[PDB]
Design a protein around this nucleic acid. Structure first.
Ligand SMILES: [Zn+2]
Ligand SMILES: [Zn+2]
Lengths: 343, 549, 550, 343
DNA sequence: CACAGTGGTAGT
DNA sequence: ACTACCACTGTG
DNA sequence: CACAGTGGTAGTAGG
DNA sequence: CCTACTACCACTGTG
DNA sequence: CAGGATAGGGCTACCGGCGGTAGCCCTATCC
DNA sequence: GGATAGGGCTACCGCCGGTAGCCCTATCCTG
């Protein structure tokens, strides 16, 4: 339940906010590098070598039959089965990606890695090009199905305008449903999900994925709240039901984290634009239950409290890699990073 | 009568770099002495400015502009363009005040309209013609440094700016059999034709913020390509039609936006997709097969990976494009940076010849930094040229001089290397007037038509006498000069004009304004710097300045 | 006809920063637009300024000028002052340009003659008075750097520039044992009053080009210190005298010129013969003894060690000097760099308090750097002070305030340090406008009266609450600030009107003119600049921009 | 017969053009700095040692009775019978010293040095402050007797103005035959010596000195002229005679080493203001004459042949120091390129 | 009170 | 049609 | 082979 | 003989 | 053995100078 | 030998501190 000052010798100017952190077999993988594939890493993925609490970043490679992907910042990421899903991402050409990226680990041979970042085709009511949100599969009756709580994105070109070309308007409030033996997806205008939220930290479960917090720009609000999602997924899927719940804590864009159980910890996003969420609240879910156990905020030092921003994600197991702006003589350090070991 | 007109004292304000606080100083002293009403006061020429800056002269499109607003009351817009600088999203720390490419472009048009029609009546040609003004334009984005705002209002911008600055260069009309040159800009590299559009506060290296700010402009542009700006100026609708030949992007940023690997790669060219070694060997025959449409398709295959190949196989199969092309550039180069790089390489070559490195191929970095400070000392005393942290243009053209070769050969007992450098620099100075010129075919056509064999003999020399360098290597610019030059000339029509020789010539004024002639503000210093720099760049004003005759 | 007087212009050029060729653009344009020669052509401005420059208004010296030529048309002396260029001799890579001291004075006076007359009139004194004045002029020898190296016709000057500059603070006369000062400067540290004298592209780091080039200054200056001018203003020969309180030099350059030990030494003050540890225990009950002639006899003894001592105890006898003071400088300070040094020390102090170093004086180095980094980030957050490299005056004055110390106290993990920083900052604030003001007699007299106990509590907060960072390691400017300000203001009137603030701002103009208002030709730059940064700072022209409204 | 690129760890830009070396007691010694005695070396002098081409300047502490003379550029220096006499020189404030400086030694134990340095009172008719010259010594009756001659100088105060404050009047060539250690001074203007010069290389051989080279700014020329200034002190009075030699050499600011007894290799200087002397000149000081045989030149570096300035003095063991500047990348980064000449 | 600016509205 | 804030300057 | 300055002097048009 | 219009000089920022 | 030296922290002054990003590509180390 | 640091090129358009000097303070010799 405490942290450490992870440091980066080189490639430090690669950890841009919104960067995912893939967790393959414990081995962790940076994703969402700054510019684009740089021939030091012609893919974007970065083998994330934490040693002696120092951080280094080896490159990483993709299979021949993979689709080299753009480094996505604030994408809709997941972790299920070794096999990821990555939607949106806000390509560093500031374009949102309708493309879904299924990142696996192909052949961890000779103490290295290589992935199969396959794309996918989405028949039916495709989900808009989005970002901020988090896709997550529902392990229900052993049938693959994925929930995509629409995050924030740009309007359809039938409505967009250059004066505010980057006007990001929270996507339509849904829980888009996407297959993974087909790649074809569906969705439903829920009578219950009537708030266009983005940057939630969707904690996963068999079916009761719980949509903790977020920041719905629809009124520039941080609705501390939740939402229930009951994927009825027979071979013929009928319409899901929702059951809103209380307990949701106010987080704008926080970091999920599992602990090899249903005891996920949710470490700080933002309770306020300029007053970030210095508190690390928890959860402990079951079949159709959820709580929040406010944990003692790891007593850090003068710096991170007064940073006004941070950014990161789960190192994967029970720990969170996130960083704060550290502009001193950069014109030097580009950031000041921090990992959080829980328990 | 009774003194001046407002726009006139506006010209005498901006086209002489008078701060509109110092303008008032001059005005109030005038009142103290003159008494008469000259130099129409600040609010008068201010409501004049609002005329010249975009969003006053109205306009329209016969194919309706898609993804764009149908409003002509919008000048300085927030480049962030709805990219909320919240914590949830990317921390865009950029003071971005940008014009709109549609409104700004038409503002320049109606700003130059008197010149337009001046030329229109010339050529013994009509003035009534409303046909499609198939204008030809460039788009020059320079990324700069040492632009330090040191007490902002919270936006932690980088100490590095980048000013996407367009420029209109020629206007033509489908008059039957030909397209006349209505206003063939005399100095398309002159800052007073460097139309600023978007003065981001961001790194040339940054690639998210940069694109967050230039995705609106290129959306505007890709929609303009399809449309025709059917305005009405001179009390007549002069149907415009567009093509945005963006070339003024410095090669670094060129490779960037189109997505290519940064300079220093084994794939050095924004053109012909040739390797570094195929450049060192062939060195004269490379065909343009590397465009932005081809580049978008090429990144699309570098991702789709449909044949399922590995990294290097794809970099070879895409021929270099790793990222996704952003700007629909038209493949070309910047005579400016071409000269800067070629002269940096000649400077390396000169110090080396002082190290007789043609004999001794390899050497220690100390002996490089030595018998090279002697190059500096000698170009100090004999020639009038100094050491500079980074190469520049005055230094180049004062170095691209057979006199420079005499200066470097004053300290090389090797006569064969003397003649080597003599031929080298004479052949390069027969090349440079073919791209470094605003219009060679009209200016130096003999060098231009000899250029093919010029490049031939130059490559042959590179092989022969300068192989300690250029052994399986070459500069991006030595390839862009020893090839793609005639192709660019014939396809575009010139280089020295479309080149970025002016945008960088406009960064000087950008800094001059940010420091002197625009508010030392937090976030709207770019608002008034853009204003000021458009005003300097207003033909409607320059005409008042060439008025002497 | 609306043709201005040519000298009415030359004040709409060197006061709107225009450039000769740019003003000729304006001229051509307005002219062929309205037809009328409203402004006056470039050659008109040239022929006009030829009188405002030095060497146009003759004069004489009741005591003769020793080691000077009586000529009175010395436009722009090569700052080299006929210095040898034979490579046999020292290689002088400094393209210099000097107005002749005792010819620049007369130009400012015949230009301030307007103002002297207006003042003695508004003071009821006879405007036709031939009386012996006494002028107090402030030399501000700055050591600017990082200017440029223009591609030169041979010479290779260091990319730096000294800038000697005489600022005529006041013009006085003992009217019947009463000294009705005639010229109370309205803005002593003004961009418009620091009249540029010499612009060498040497560097204050040097003492050879600087001195080879300024020994002429100091020779004619030690002559003028003992001779009386007489300028024909309004026809009357006003017979001025000078006193030359030239004490705007920064501590680096005043240490160089006066040949002191060094800036950072166990010897701390260029005004008192006291060490650093002594000045880190008392801090309040100092004296002022380091007079220039004292330093000269001190260098005599150092160069002779008449009692025949060794290095260290000699340096304790001379108490500070190693070199030969070649200037004249009454012991005083530079309010500008005083504020700057105190503010840099305070930024360090805030690093410390952030690092709790009031308890842990052995904390690491990268932790010092991370405190600096978070503090830069905070003052960019709260006070909006983006990170600078060393320090500056806009940032110092944004910093040395009860708001910054609060937004920083919130970071300190001790309310004791909260209140200690509060008291320190607010006391230094109570005592800063003392010398930062152009005069305390009217802007903070209570500050002076209380200054004894004020600096006393300052020192005694540094002692106990700041045993760290001040166990010996007291700055130079804390010593000055604390136990020299009263001595100075008493013996010397004020301070802020004697520091080189106006000079360090005129460096900006030096850049602006070496960039826009001069011939870009190494051999000429200083000529045109010195001339133009003068016309800028010539009242005959400002009156045409201030007498309008005033 | 050797040259090499001596190097410098600390205090590089302190070796200023126009300084004085001192081959003293077999130990070489720099003297004459750039700024002033810097309290890292408040002495004034420096301990010049060199091994493996990395120059060491070990600040040479002065002594109890050691009058701290200032840093003198282009002074007069004669290695007297384990002593010196340091006269004139342009003080670092650009004024000239009216004072000879007997730079004796006090102690040397443990490879240390003390440098007893005593100002000596010039008496009666004495020479004015000048520089660029070189005093020397003679032994008429076996008696150390000086010869100070030539030497640039700022014009006399009464005739010297501020416009020309930095004019350098080659002083009246007036051989100053100081008789020190019981008196100081005895001057004598010479009939054969009309035009005054400086930078003149003189030699302290027995019963006579042999002037050589120099610059008489009165003509701005480098007169090819020599002078046998003999001394013959009867029991009561001194005496001197001058006799030009046919075959003098035309250089100014040349450097005088020996390489062995009764033989000096005057290395370089400034033949013509723009054409530095790129040759050496061996001399043999016979019992009544001299023969300036031009020793074979050590073919210079690629830079000394293509710079405009350099300097040095006698390091004793037939060795000579030199410096050729380097341009402003940086200006003080390199500040010079030094060179030793064992010849 | 460095300070003489820097547009720009605000107001008047 | 004039100044007054007004956050901020670049000299430092 | 940019371009628009950079000011002093120079050199020469209308009286 | 005087004033006003260019013609230069090498070099400048911006690269 | 013990001053003595040499150079680095760090004390000022301070108003920056020998190099640096940002890539890249072709070298070089450890089990 | 298959990963992992350094030093040159290649295009950019200086940025992490540049130091200038002066204490102490931390190591480095004669075994
Ligand atoms: Zn190509
Ligand atoms: Zn003192």
């Amino acid at each position: 339940m405490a942290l450490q000052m992870v440091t980066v010798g080189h490639n430090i100017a690669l950890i841009q906010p919104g960067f995912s952190l893939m967790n393959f077999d414990g081995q962790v993988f940076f994703f969402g590098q700054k510019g684009w594939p740089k021939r030091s890493c012609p893919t974007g993925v970065f083998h994330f070598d934490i040693k002696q609490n120092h951080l280094k970043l080896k490159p990483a490679i993709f299979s021949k039959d993979s689709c080299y992907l753009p480094p996505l910042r604030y994408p809709a990421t997941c972790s299920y089965k070794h096999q990821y899903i990555i939607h949106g991402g806000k390509t560093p050409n500031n374009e949102l990606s309708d493309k879904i990226y299924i990142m696996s680990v192909a052949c961890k041979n000779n103490k290295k890695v290589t992935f199969r970042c396959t794309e996918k085709d989405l028949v039916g009511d495709v989900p808009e090009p989005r970002y901020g949100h988090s896709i997550d599969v529902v392990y229900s009756r052993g049938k693959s199905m994925g929930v995509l709580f629409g995050g924030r994105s740009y309007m359809p070109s039938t409505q967009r305008t250059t004066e505010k070309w980057n006007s990001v308007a929270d996507c339509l409030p849904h829980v888009f449903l996407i297959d993974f033996e087909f790649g074809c997806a569906t969705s439903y205008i829920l009578p219950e999900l009537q708030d266009g939220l983005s940057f939630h930290v969707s904690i996963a479960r068999n079916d009761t994925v719980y949509i903790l917090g977020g920041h719905s720009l629809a009124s520039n609000i941080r609705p501390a709240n939740l939402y229930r999602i009951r994927v009825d997924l027979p071979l013929g899927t009928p319409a899901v039901n929702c059951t809103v719940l209380p307990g949701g804590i106010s987080v704008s864009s926080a970091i999920l984290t599992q602990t090899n159980n249903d005891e996920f910890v949710i470490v700080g996003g933002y309770q306020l634009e300029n007053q970030k969420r210095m508190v690390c609240s928890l959860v402990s879910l079951g079949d159709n239950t959820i709580e929040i156990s406010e944990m003692e905020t790891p007593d850090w030092t003068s710096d991170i409290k007064h940073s006004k921003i941070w950014f990161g994600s789960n190192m994967g197991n029970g720990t969170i890699f996130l960083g704060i702006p550290g502009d001193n003589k950069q014109a030097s350090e580009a950031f000041y990073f921090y990992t959080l070991r829980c328990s | 009568g009774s003194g001046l007109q407002p726009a006139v004292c506006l010209a005498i304000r901006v086209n002489t770099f008078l701060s509109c606080s110092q303008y008032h100083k001059m005005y109030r002293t005038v009142k103290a002495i003159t008494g008469r009403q000259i130099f129409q006061p600040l609010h008068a020429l201010r409501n004049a400015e609002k005329v010249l800056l975009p969003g006053y002269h109205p306009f329209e499109w016969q194919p309706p502009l898609k993804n764009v607003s149908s409003r002509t009351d919008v000048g300085i817009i927030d480049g962030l363009s709805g990219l909320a600088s919240s914590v949830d999203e990317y921390p865009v720390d950029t003071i971005a005040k940008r014009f709109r490419y549609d409104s700004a472009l038409v503002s320049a048009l109606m700003d130059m309209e008197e010149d337009i029609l001046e030329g229109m009546r010339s050529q013994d040609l009509d003035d009534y013609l409303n046909g499609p003004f198939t204008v030809v334009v460039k788009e020059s984005c320079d990324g700069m440094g040492d632009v330090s705002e040191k007490h902002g209002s919270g936006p932690a911008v980088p100490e590095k700016a980048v000013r996407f600055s367009f420029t209109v260069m020629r206007i033509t009309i489908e008059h039957g059999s030909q397209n006349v040159k209505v206003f063939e800009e005399p100095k398309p590299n002159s800052v007073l034709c460097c139309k600023p559009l978007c003065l981001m506060l961001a790194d040339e290296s940054d690639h998210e913020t940069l694109t967050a700010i230039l995705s609106p402009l290129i959306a505007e542009r890709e929609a303009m390509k399809s449309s025709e700006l059917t305005l009405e100026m001179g009390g007549i609708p002069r149907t415009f039609k567009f093509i945005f030949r963006g070339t003024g992007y410095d090669e670094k940023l060129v490779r960037e936006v189109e997505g290519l690997e940064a300079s220093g790669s084994v794939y050095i060219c924004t053109l012909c997709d040739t390797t570094r070694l195929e450049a060192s060997q062939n060195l004269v025959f490379h065909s343009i097969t590397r465009s932005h449409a081809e580049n978008l398709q090429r990144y699309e295959v570098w991702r789709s990976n449909p044949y399922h190949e590995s990294v290097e196989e794809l970099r070879d199969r895409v021929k270099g494009v790793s990222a996704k092309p952003f700007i629909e550039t038209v493949p070309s180069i910047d005579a400016l940076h071409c000269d800067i790089g070629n002269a940096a390489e000649f400077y390396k070559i000169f110090q080396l010849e002082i190290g007789e490195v043609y004999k001794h191929p390899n050497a220690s970095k100390e002996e490089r930094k030595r018998w090279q400070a002697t190059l500096d000392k000698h170009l100090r005393k004999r020639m009038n040229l100094k050491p500079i942290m980074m190469m520049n243009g005055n230094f180049a053209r004062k170095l691209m001089t057979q006199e420079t070769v005499d200066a470097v050969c004053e300290l090389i007992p090797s006569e064969e290397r003397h003649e080597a450098l003599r031929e080298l620099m004479d052949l390069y100075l027969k090349m440079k007037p073919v791209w470094r010129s605003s219009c060679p075919a009209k200016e130096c056509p003999e060098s231009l038509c000899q250029y093919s064999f010029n490049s031939q003999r130059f490559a042959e020399l590179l092989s022969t006498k300068f192989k300690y360098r250029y052994e399986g290597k070459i500069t991006n610019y030595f390839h862009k000069t020893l090839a793609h030059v005639p192709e660019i000339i014939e396809r575009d029509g010139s280089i020295g004009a479309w080149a970025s020789e002016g945008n960088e010539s406009g960064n000087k004024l950008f800094r001059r304004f940010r420091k002197m002639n625009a508010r030392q503000s937090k976030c709207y210093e770019m608002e008034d710097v853009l204003k000021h720099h458009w005003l300097y760049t207003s033909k409607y004003l320059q005409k008042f300045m060439n008025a002497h005759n």
